[PDB]
Each structure stands twice: as C-alpha cells, then as structure tokens.
Symmetry: D3
Subunit: 175 residues, 6 copies
C-alpha cells in the first residue's frame, strides 16, 4: 500500500514524497486517506487556480497541525496521483491558516531521477517567478472558501526545511 512507503532512504536529505495532486491539474483537491490508503476527493476548489507544482506528503511524519508534512515538487512533466517520487528538500514556505502553522516544503527530484534540479541547493536558487507564483497560489486559492483563510509568512532555507522533516519524523514515532 501507499501506507508502507518509507519516509526516505536517508532523512532528511533523501526523502520520498507521495503525490496527491499533479502540477497544472484541474482544481480537485485529493488527499490519501490514512485509513484505506485510497485517493479521496476532499473538495472541488471554487477558484480558477491550478497547483503550480505537484503536491503531496511524506509518509510517517506528523507536522504540528496533526498530519503529514506537505511538499511541493517541481518536475519537467506532471506526475500521477499516488506515485512516489524520490526528492531532496530545498526550502520551506511558512504560513498560518485556521489550524495554525502549516509550512509547505519545496523539494526537487533527486539526482538519480534527473540531473536537471542538481543546481538547486537552497531556496535562493529556485526561480523567483516560481516562488512568487506558489506564494500567490496559497495566498488566494481559498479566497472563496467560507470557513477558511491563509496567511503567508515567507520563505526559509533548506536547513529550516530539513529540521521540520526531522522534527515531524520524530513526533510521528511517539504520538
């Protein structure tokens, strides 16, 4: 099952992200259910907005807000929902919604899948336009969602990204 995917080969620099939502997809937000492992429809987003990158989670991790660390994963072509990609974390985008702190890591395909992301070691190496586009996306994608709201605190580095993976991996191994 998707529930038995390792967190990574070598955490926190060598991790697996379970893809839930492909880059550039229609605006359906899917979630792996932690009970069945199946792909569930969470909602049909009301804005005319698309995820700017592939969107998923690291298995066996528990972020401060009670669920797995979310990850955005840029790729030359959109991935399949339910596929697992080997990645390297490179950066984190801090935000608050109406559940508190909810960081989104950014991680690039690992060098064994591809050499293309090898120049990207830290948050400053991501294209400006891509960072601006991502932030705008999480700023606005819920604008028409009555019970929901989001505030974007800003970008941090790969070491802040890694420390979140370790803290969330440890917290899953007790709680």
């Amino acid at each position: 099952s998707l529930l038995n995917v390792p967190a990574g080969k070598d955490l926190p620099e060598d991790i697996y992200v379970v893809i839930e939502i492909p880059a550039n997809a229609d605006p359906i937000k899917y979630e792996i259910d932690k009970e069945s492992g199946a792909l569930f429809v969470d909602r049909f987003m009301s804005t005319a907005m698309f995820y700017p990158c592939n969107y998923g989670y690291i298995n066996h991790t528990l972020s401060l807000d009670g669920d797995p660390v979310d990850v955005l994963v840029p790729t030359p072509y959109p991935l399949q929902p339910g596929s697992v990609i080997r990645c390297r974390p490179v950066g984190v985008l801090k935000m608050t919604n109406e559940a508190g702190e909810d960081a989104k890591l950014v991680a690039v395909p690992h060098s064994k899948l591809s050499k293309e992301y090898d120049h990207i070691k830290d948050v400053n190496d991501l294209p400006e336009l891509l960072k601006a586009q991502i932030a705008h996306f999480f700023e606005h994608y819920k604008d028409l969602e009555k019970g929901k709201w989001v505030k974007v605190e800003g970008w941090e580095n790969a070491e802040a990204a890694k420390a979140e993976i370790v803290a969330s991996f440890e917290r899953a191994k007790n709680k």
Copy 2:
C-alpha cells in the same frame, strides 16, 4: 485498499462512490477487481461514445444482478480512476440488460466537497439534457457488442434510489 472503503458515513443519504471511469474519457471500461482491488481492463468499447458522467460503485453493496450498486456522479471536472467521492443520491435510472434489472443511481457531490450541487435534491432537478444524454448513452453504448443488449425503463426519484442502497447494503451483509 479500495476493498476497505466504507459504503458511506451515513447511508443511504451520505455515501462513498469508488470511481472506475472518469467523465469524458476514452471508451475503455474498467472495473475494480474484488479479489485484488486493482483496476482491470474489462473491454475496449466499439462505439464512438464517452461516459457522460464519472462512473463507479458503492463498496459493500450487492445489487440484484450479483455486484455492487453502480453510480453516476456529475462533477465540474473529471475524476481519477480509483478515487473515492463523497456523494448524495438523487435519482435512479432503471434498465434491463441480459442479466436482468441493473439500475444506475445518480448521486451528486456532497455539500462538503462543493456547494454547486446543493440545489439538486431529486431527479426532476437534474438538467433535462443531462438525463437525456445519460439514457441515450446506456441505450446505445453496447449497440455493436454481439452478446449484449440493454433496455432503458426510465427515471425514478431519490427515495427509490435510497431504498436500493439500503436493500443492496442489507443483501451484502448476509449473502
């Protein structure tokens, strides 16, 4: 697995439909296998016809013809094969093929995924064109299938739809 998906949170008005065939897809008819839970090719349909809605089934249900209640689920964007959507039943389309009675429910996305279908409580609230299109589809999609044939008896209401879900859920819990 897809085999451990509940029938619904609150049957028969609050159910889960396991998607097998997306709206507007190429004409490949897929089926979840009840042994592995994998998505199997059932056939390559010979007509130049597409499913007018997403097409799947309610798990843990057994309809008179020896398999799960089939459901059609209209959505603003096509869903992924193997995804689970939370829905409300709204209507039923009665038909006979060469296995007897084989109803197809129609159910709309539940209000928690979306407000868009909230005005649709019963069969009369579905667009005319959509009902006519669906009926035409099941009338004709097998026209070129030598061993197979279909007759479309007509539309019934949400209460007829719900009573089929309850009767099929009970029959799965003994047979």
Copy 3:
C-alpha cells in the same frame, strides 16, 4: 494489491500485464515497487521520445535479469498506470543493455476485451511501422543516459515469446 495479481488465467497464452507507462505519455519512467506495490518515479528520461505502446510487466515472473518479464501492449487508447490488461503474447524483441539479455514481449489485448487484435497471431502480423518504431525507441531512448546503453538483437516469434513466459514463471516459483 497489484502484488496479488495472477500471472494469467492460462499461461502462457492467456496472461495479465500490469501497466506501468501508458502509450504516448510524457517521458516519466515509472515502476511498480515490489515492496509496497506503489507506483514509483524511476526517472525523468532526457530524450524527447514517448513509449510507442503501453509498457508493463507480468506479475510472478522473473526474467534472466532479475525482474519481471516486461511487455508492450498496443491498444486503441492509452491505459491507466496500475491497470491490469488481459493479453495474448505474440512476439518478442531481443536486446542487451548493461545487465545482459532483456527481451521485451509484445502482447495484444485478448479477444474478450476486443476483437481488433484477433488477426494478430505472430510477429509477422504486427504492422511493420509499429515494429520499426518500437525498435527505434529502445535503440535511442537512453542515448543521453550516461551510465546506460542498449543493443537491439531483433524480433522473434510467438513461440519464443511463450517459452520466455514459461521459463520466467518457473524461475519465479523457485528462486
């Protein structure tokens, strides 16, 4: 799971192929992981090339090179990653990479899915253009892959294809 799919109903003439890569897809090479059964990204291919047919494997088989018999499966429309298709083997394309012998069978949809492939009994009945296109594909798709290289030895018949399925099925039942 995909790990409990039978090898076929009646080997070697009646087999199941687990689809990993759809015909005409973006150039992402996916692999079912034999540990979780999930779909994993293996790499982002560097050539501007697409798989000319659907690409997968027969479960419960072990080819000389330490993994399941690979299969190419032509279909009127591209299949979904992780779907299982019932097929008949019709031919085999022999090649060496930097792991030795790595045949790729060709198999067509079985007559119960479709009548369209029924005229194809053996390797000579496949369109010339399709065989030439496939061979060119495996010749070149790795051209830009530093550690990797491929040589295409040529086409053999359905009986050579079947004997490989039997030898690989037997070898999985001991090793």
Copy 4:
C-alpha cells in the same frame, strides 16, 4: 485563406481535405464559413459521442445538397481544425438526412505523408470495426436533435467515391 485551397493536385485520386473537426474531439461541430473562411461553431451536439475520424471537406466542390463534399480522414494522431491534408479517396458511405442524399467519403493520408495507409485501396480494406463505428456514429449522433434525422444506406467503393468528387467538382464550376 482556406478559401483558396485547391481541390487536389490531381483529382479525383489526389485531393486536399480541409479539416473541420479532429478525431476524438469534444462534441462541438464546427464548419468553415464560406464567406469569411473562419471556423464557426455550428452547434454543441447533445449526444455523448465523438467523431471517430477527422471530419472536413474538399474545397471547390458542391455536392447534391448544396455544399462541399464531406470527407472522413483516419490518421495516426488527430489533426488541427483548419489544417489541410493531402489524401486518397477510398470509399463512400451513403445516407439520407432531411436534405436528401449526403454521402461521406472516406479518404486516407496520401503516401507522401505516410506509408501506413498504402495497403488501403478500397472500402473492403478498411477495418470492419472502423466502418461499423462510423456508420453507428452517423446513425445516432443526431438522435437528440429535434429537427433532424439520418438514414444510412451503406458502403460503396473507391470508384463510386471518385465519381462523386468529379461530379461535385464539375457542378461547382458552373452553378
């Protein structure tokens, strides 16, 4: 403009078809307007049906029903609306709607675009399934169109197809 496209290089065996509707497209019926040459929406078809082949017309031709000879053009990949393909006529499908006689030729890509259709010289060489699929399509695509109706008289040979191109080309050069 599309209005200055020749009828063919060497009529009736070497012709140009102006594409209006791609194979496998959403069910929007487009028409080149003979006044502007622009692509106009003619209607949104109500059936869940797709054109089984690319659909267009031969320029400078006038069929008995007051407009250009319609052509269906099978191709390995769908064409762009408004593109011109060089073809060879191979067959004709006779029908009546509520304007009388309205044949649809079938023509395959000419050998200079492709060798793939070179084995198809006459109507008997087209796949059975394709002929059956096309006929079913024109039989039914208007079923839900109140003012409209279609009857399918059947298949004729390449020489009947060519004689229609010549008669329609001559009739355009007087009327």
Copy 5:
C-alpha cells in the same frame, strides 16, 4: 479573414464572439492582431490561474478604452482560438484597470447552437459560483504584473450589456 466577421446577425441581442482564449487553457493570453488577423501571443501570465470561460471579442466594435468589446462565453466544452460563436448577451461585469473603464460582457451560446443556456436571460440567472469565480479571476490574474492593476466594480444586467454593444458598435462606425 477574422477581420470580416460581422458583429452579429441582429445586434445587440444576436451577436458573434471571436474566441481568443479557451476556457480552462494554460495561462497564455492571446489577442487577434487587427492588422493581420493572426493570433498573437500577448503574454505568458505569471499567476497560476486559468480563464474560467472562453474569452474573446465582438468584431467591428470599439469600447471606451480603444478596442473591441470583450466577452466571456461559457460553453459545455472549451472552444478553439479563432473560432466564431453565435451568442446572446446576458450581463456585464464592470471594472477599472490602468486604462479606465473596461467592462466584460457575459454572453451564452445562442439557442440555435444549443438549448442548454436558454434558461439564462439575465445576470441573476447565471450560477452564483460562476459569477464569483469570474470576478475573483479578473481581480487577481494580474497580481504579479508590475505595470498593471484592476478594480472590479460589479455586475449589471442584460440591458446594460446590450447598451454597451450598441454604443460600441456606433462608435466603431465613426471613429
């Protein structure tokens, strides 16, 4: 050419909209050039946003801001860039950018293309969600465009929509 398309058959209730940008398309903003009639790239929008409807213009019209009346045209399936659709105006969305007043009409497919929009006579009959989605789109699609900015004044009725078509058609016939 697209430059010789009439404004409508019977203005202002029966008009032609020249499509420039399909509903749900990648975020490339195209423009017909009034010199050649060709489709030109105007820019690659920086937001992760899609046009919620098809987007074009009425030919032979000049709006206060020095170019043709812009129109949004909802359709069951996305249209082709450069296609002409027959529509009925139903409503107008008023806004200011850094060129002043720049209304966008909404118009639905005319009854001869389709019966589906026949219930929509005025702005109040458009789905709420669709109006909210459109307004959000024009509010935000330029957020990352340095020299550009937009303010959304709100919705007006079909009679306000028609009077704009007449005033813009008259102004094109002198200026």
Copy 6:
C-alpha cells in the same frame, strides 16, 4: 493573413516567429503554405519523438535552402499552431540534411511577454539538457525516413544567429 506578418519590430534582435508545431505535440509535421497561408500536413513522422520546443519560422526571410529561417522557441506552455510570438534570438544549431546547410535558430520569448527568459542572452545560458535534447531530436527524428538524413554540426552564438536573420532577410528582399 499569416503571410502579412512582419519579420520583427526591430530586426535582428526583435523578431516575430510564426508557430507551426507546438512543443510536446503528437508527431505531425505541419508547414504554413506560402500560397494560401493555410496550415498543411507535411507528414506523419514515423519515430516516437516529439518536438522539444515550439517550432516555426520568421516571415519574409529566405534561408540558403530556399525557405524561411526556422526557429525553436521554448515557452512555459505549448503554443497554438498559427500563433505569432515576439522573440529574441539567442543561438543557432548548425546542420546539414539532403538540401545542404539548414540552421535552426533558438529564440526566447521577448521580455514584454515574460521576464522568465531575460537571463538568457546567449547559447551558453540555455540549459545543457535542453541543448542536448534538441540536438538529439534533429539527429534522430528522421531515422526511419527513407529519402532523408541529417547531420548536426553544432551550436553557435547569438551574433551568428542574428547575422543569419539579417542575411536571410536581405536575400528575401531581392530573390
């Protein structure tokens, strides 16, 4: 028409490329016809290869081999056949086929469409992978084309690219 598109606003650094083939498209090679301006099918390529970038030509230019300077134009999303993009030339890929010298320029979207390509001034600033992918493509896309063959001489700089645009623009204004 597409025949009246200028060569550029300010040649050779500010040019218009007429798109013929979108990035990542099915393998149909289209050509604008210089007689009608329509999009013609030139052939259905036999390899399983896709154009790695959008592919078109500069109007009013005549390259040594008797037709317009060909251009490859990388873009965040694939363009429409027959659209015109404003670009800046950045590099040239020299090759011989069986008509002699047939350079392909590379040009990026001009800064007014987008800021994304602004860091790319010369051939060395294009991603390595992209240059390698393009060269591999023109090396191999004709491998199965009996009468045709291609040899790839290599990359030159923006000044070599510009001098070709000027020489080809001058040669069109006499010959």
